[PDB]
C-alpha cells in the first residue's frame, strides 16, 4: 500500500542545484527500509543514485557523490534528493524508490538477504537548460466523425509551444478516461513541445455533455481547463 | 560489476531467457525490472522465484552463485520492453547496480493498419495569428511511417513535424505529425491533406478552410 510520488521543479539551470522530494503515502518513512533515488537519462540505463534509511545513514553512487545529497524530513513524511553543479549529463527522469531492510550479519529473517526495489514513483521529468519556461497555448480540435466508428466522434485539445516536458492532460476532471488517447509530444524546430490529446465520443452526446480537457504545466505553473464546442 | 545480455529476440509466444552476471549476486542475489518508454520500472522478479502480485505466471527467474536468468515463457507482445538486472554489493560501502539492460525484441507480431484523423487549425488560433494542422496516426504495427504534407496538391518543404512512433496500451503504435502555417498560408490554399504510408499503403486525409 506503500506510495511514492516525486515533486519537484523541471527546469535547471546549468550549475545550479537539482532539489527533489518524494512524498510517501499508505505507510510511514520511520521504518528499516532504504529510500532510494534512480535516474533514467534519456536512451541510456538505469543509474542508482543513493539511498538513505531513517535513523541510519546515506549511501550513494560513488560518480555523483561529490554531488548529492539525501535528506529526510520525518515531520511530513517525505524524502529529498539535492544534485549540485548540474550539467546536461544530469537531464533525465528522476525517480524515487523503497528497498526494504537487508542484514550484513547471520542470523536474520530469511526476507532480509535479497535485495529489491519494490515500490516506484512515478518518475519527475528534469531538464537542464539555459532556456526559460514557457507555458502551452492550448486549442480545441472540434469534434469530427470520419475516423471513428460508427455513432462516435472525435474531439480534443492541442497543448502548443510549451517548454519544458511535460504536461498532463484529464477530460472532465478525471470523470472521463474511456476512450482517451494522449499522443507523445514532439518537439519543433523552435525548441518548445507539442501535443494533443483526443477522446472518442458517443455523437448522440455532442450537443448535450460538456467536454473540458484539463491540461497541466507544473514547469510553467500554468493550469488551461478548455472547452471543446462541436463547430457550426 | 553487473554484466547482461544487451539484445536477445524471441519469436511471439516462445520462451525466452535473459541472463545476468555479477559477484554481487553471491549475496542478495538478482532482481528483474521492466522498463518501457515513457513509463517506470516495475519489478517482475526477484530472489527465490518471487513474484509480485499482478505479475503474470508466464514470468520466473532464479539466481545460482554469481549468476541470474529471468524466464519468460509464452512470450507476448506486451512483453517486448528494456529488462534490466539489479543487485546489491557485498563490498565496502555495498552499493546498489544496475547492469546495462537488456533490449527484448519479439518478433512476428502481427500486421495492423493505420487510422488517420487531421484536425484543421482552430479559429480562435487563427485568431492568435498562427494555424497548425494536426495529423494523429494510431493502431499500426510495426512502428515504421513516412509522413508526407501537400498544400492543394504540391509538397510542404517547412513547417512538418512528426513524432517517433511509441507503443499504445494495445501494443500497436501511434505516432503524430504537425505542419505550422500561418493563417495567409492557410487561407491561401484550397485544401491540405496528410498523407500517411504503412507497410506498401497509403491513406491520404484533407482539410478545407471554411
Known amino acids: 500500500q506503500v506510495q511514492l510520488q516525486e515533486s519537484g521543479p523541471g527546469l535547471v539551470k546549468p550549475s545550479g542545484t537539482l532539489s527533489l522530494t518524494c512524498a510517501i503515502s499508505?505507510?510511514?518513512?520511520?521504518?528499516?527500509?532504504?529510500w532510494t533515488w534512480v535516474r533514467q537519462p534519456p536512451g541510456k540505463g538505469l543509474q542508482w543514485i543513493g539511498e538513505i534509511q531513517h535513523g541510519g545513514g546515506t549511501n550513494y553512487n560513488p560518480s555523483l557523490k561529490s554531488r548529492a545529497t539525501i535528506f529526510v524530513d520525518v515531520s511530513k513524511n517525505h524524502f529529498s534528493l539535492r544534485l549540485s553543479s548540474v550539467t546536461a549529463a544530469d537531464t533525465a527522469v528522476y525517480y524515487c524508490?523503497?528497498?526494504?531492510?537487508?542484514?550484513?550479519?547471520?542470523?536474520?529473517?530469511?526476507?532480509?538477504?535479497?535485495?529489491?526495489?519494490?515500490?516506484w514513483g512515478k518518475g519527475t521529468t528534469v531538464t537542464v537548460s539555459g532556456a526559460s519556461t514557457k507555458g502551452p497555448s492550448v486549442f480545441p480540435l472540434a469534434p469530427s466523425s470520419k475516423s471513428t466508428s460508427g455513432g462516435t466522434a472525435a474531439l480534443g485539445c492541442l497543448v502548443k509551444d510549451y517548454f519544458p516536458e511535460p504536461v498532463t492532460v484529464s477530460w472532465n476532471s478525471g470523470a472521463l478516461t474511456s476512450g482517451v488517447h494522449t499522443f507523445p509530444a514532439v518537439l519543433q524546430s523552435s525548441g518548445l513541445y507539442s501535443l494533443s490529446s483526443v477522446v472518442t465520443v458517443p455523437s448522440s452526446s455532442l450537443g448535450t455533455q460538456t467536454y473540458i480537457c484539463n491540461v497541466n504545466h507544473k514547469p510553467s505553473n500554468t493550469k488551461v481547463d478548455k472547452r471543446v464546442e462541436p463547430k457550426s | 560489476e553487473l554484466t547482461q545480455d544487451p539484445a536477445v529476440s524471441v519469436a511471439l509466444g516462445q520462451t525466452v531467457r535473459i541472463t545476468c552476471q555479477g559477484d554481487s549476486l553471491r549475496g542478495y542475489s538478482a532482481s528483474w525490472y521492466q522498463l518501457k518508454p515513457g513509463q517506470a520500472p516495475v519489478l517482475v522478479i526477484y530472489g527465490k522465484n518471487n513474484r509480485p502480485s499482478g505479475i503474470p505466471d508466464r514470468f520466473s527467474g532464479s539466481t545460482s552463485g554469481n549468476r541470474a536468468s529471468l524466464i519468460i515463457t509464452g512470450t507476448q507482445a506486451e512483453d517486448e520492453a528494456d529488462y534490466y538486472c539489479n543487485s546489491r554489493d557485498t563490498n565496502g560501502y555495498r552499493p546498489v547496480l544496475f547492469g546495462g539492460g537488456t533490449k527484448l525484441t519479439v518478433l512476428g507480431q502481427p500486421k495492423g493498419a493505420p487510422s488517420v484523423t487531421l484536425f484543421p487549425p482552430s479559429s480562435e488560433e487563427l485568431q492568435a495569428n498562427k494555424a497548425t494542422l494536426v495529423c494523429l496516426i494510431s493502431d499500426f504495427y510495426p512502428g515504421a511511417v513516412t509522413v508526407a504534407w501537400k498544400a492543394d496538391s504540391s509538397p510542404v518543404k517547412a513547417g512538418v513535424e512528426t513524432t517517433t512512433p511509441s507503443k499504445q496500451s494495445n501494443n500497436k503504435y501511434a505516432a503524430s505529425s504537425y505542419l505550422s502555417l500561418t493563417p495567409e498560408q492557410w487561407k491561401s490554399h484550397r485544401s491540405y491533406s496528410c498523407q500517411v504510408t504503412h507497410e506498401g499503403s497509403t491513406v491520404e486525409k484533407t482539410v478545407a478552410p471554411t
Open positions: 499508505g505507510g510511514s518513512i520511520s521504518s528499516s527500509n532504504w
Open positions: 524508490a523503497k528497498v526494504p531492510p537487508y542484514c550484513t550479519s547471520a542470523s536474520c529473517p530469511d526476507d532480509y538477504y535479497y535485495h529489491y526495489m519494490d515500490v
